[PDB]
Design an enzyme around this catalytic site. Structure first.
Site, short mmCIF file in Angstrom:
data_model
loop_
_atom_site.label_atom_id
_atom_site.label_comp_id
_atom_site.label_asym_id
_atom_site.label_seq_id
_atom_site.Cartn_x
_atom_site.Cartn_y
_atom_site.Cartn_z
N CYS A 146 -0.12 0.82 7.21
CA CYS A 146 -0.13 1.21 5.81
C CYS A 146 -0.72 2.60 5.63
O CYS A 146 0.03 3.55 5.35
CB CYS A 146 -0.81 0.19 4.88
SG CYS A 146 -0.87 0.79 3.14
N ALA B 31 -4.49 3.48 7.25
CA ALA B 31 -5.32 3.67 8.45
C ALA B 31 -4.82 2.91 9.67
O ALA B 31 -5.15 3.26 10.80
CB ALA B 31 -6.77 3.31 8.16
N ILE C 103 -5.44 -0.35 10.48
CA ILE C 103 -6.44 -1.28 11.04
C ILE C 103 -6.74 -2.50 10.15
O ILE C 103 -7.05 -3.57 10.67
CB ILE C 103 -7.76 -0.57 11.46
CG1 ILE C 103 -8.45 0.10 10.26
CG2 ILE C 103 -7.52 0.45 12.59
CD1 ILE C 103 -9.89 0.48 10.54
#
Length: 276
Positions: free
Chosen positions: A211, A213, A215
């Site tokens: 999306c 980052a 993570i």
């Protein structure tokens, strides 16, 4: 031993297998789940641990960096260097390169992103909500991207894309998920959509998930997918084991205790939806 060796040992050996029954009917309480979550080391790599000159301009976030051992290295299709902020992610039963978790591409890394798509023979992109795809037709570096068809569903939009280099044309499926939570219904329909997606490359390649980052919700999507697979195949799931393996492949996967708890809820819902 060193804090690095402590981290790796924990991520290698932690586990809390849960039977289908315990997940649905007698789950760990939220307090236990939070404490279990907070024990998990992040495995964030520090900037000093990467010797890749000029990587910083290609990172969206300075502290969210790709773990060296699993990073995706670009070839020579473009621009010099092999750097993209992306890691190979192991799938169900430790099968190699099932996913690539990456940051949302910046304008200066859009060519890098498509180079990774072309190089890795990616046929599926999952985006969890700079647009790196055209409204009709754009050229990114040596790549021409064209929209073949587009269908809007209540929970996600599926784009069928064509990537061209240069007299060679490949089909890439793109799912933009516009229902990220609240409720796990849409998320499981997304996983079903992902499962139902036909392979379209010469050799099976990783699914790109991102999306911003790469993570947080990216980690939640991949943990969910793997968790469903465990429950379907074994009638049990080791969620702590899943999250630990994700962090070995990419530092910081699954950001909050709430996401961790929501993972338990989503899998409990999947379990209740399994064939009778």
């Amino acid at each position: 031993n060193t804090p690095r060796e402590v981290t790796l040992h924990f991520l290698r050996t932690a586990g809390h297998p849960l039977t289908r029954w315990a997940l649905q009917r007698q789950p760990p309480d939220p307090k236990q789940l939070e404490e279990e979550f907070l024990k998990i080391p992040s495995n964030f790599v520090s900037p000093e641990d990467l010797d890749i000159p000029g990587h910083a301009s290609k990172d969206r976030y300075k502290t969210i960096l790709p773990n060296p051992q699993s990073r995706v290295c670009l070839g020579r299709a473009q621009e010099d260097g092999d750097y993209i902020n992306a890691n190979y992610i192991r799938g169900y039963d430790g099968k190699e390169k099932v996913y690539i978790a990456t940051q949302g591409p910046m304008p200066n890394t859009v060519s890098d992103f498509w180079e990774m798509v072309w190089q890795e023979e990616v046929s599926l992109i999952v985006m969890l909500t700079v647009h790196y795809w055209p409204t009709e037709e754009e050229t990114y570096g040596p790549f021409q991207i064209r929209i073949q068809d587009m269908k809007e569903c209540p929970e996600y939009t599926v784009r069928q894309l064509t990537i061209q280099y240069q007299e060679e044309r490949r089909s890439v499926k793109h799912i933009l998920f516009s229902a990220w939570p609240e409720s796990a219904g849409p998320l499981l329909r997304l996983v079903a959509e992902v499962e139902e997606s036909p392979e379209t490359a010469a050799h099976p390649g990783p699914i790109v998930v991102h999306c911003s980052a790469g993570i947080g919700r990216t980690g939640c999507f991949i943990a969910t997918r793997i968790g469903c697979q465990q429950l379907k195949a074994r009638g049990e799931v080791d969620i702590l084991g899943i999250v630990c393996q994700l962090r070995l492949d990419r530092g910081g996967m699954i950001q909050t205790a709430e996401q961790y708890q929501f993972l338990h809820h989503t899998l409990a819902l999947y379990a209740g939806q399994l064939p009778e």
